[PDB]
Design a protein around this ligand. Structure first.
Ligand SMILES: [Zn+2]
Ligand SMILES: [Zn+2]
Lengths: 49, 49
């Protein structure tokens, strides 16, 4: 059992960087991407079914 | 700026797997996820210059 753990350990890893870089990249679509990736963690734990 | 390449190499690394696992897991939201991550490579290229 490792599928969703590899997804979590890439999607949260990307999310950390998307949230970090925002104040230094200074573009609005970075903030929009956080809202997209939030569904991709909620659906992630749903994929345990 | 050497910033977005570290995000690219996580978003495209996740993409590689999201298209592979889909037929095995059999969930329609899994196929929706790889569709949403395409914008996250288009915008991630454009914002890199
Ligand atoms: Zn995602
Ligand atoms: Zn993404």
């Amino acid at each position: 059992m490792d599928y969703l753990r590899e997804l979590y350990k890439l999607e949260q890893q990307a999310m950390k960087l998307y949230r970090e870089a925002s104040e230094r990249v200074g573009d609005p679509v970075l903030a929009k991407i956080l809202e997209d990736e939030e569904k991709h963690i909620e659906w992630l734990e749903t994929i345990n079914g």
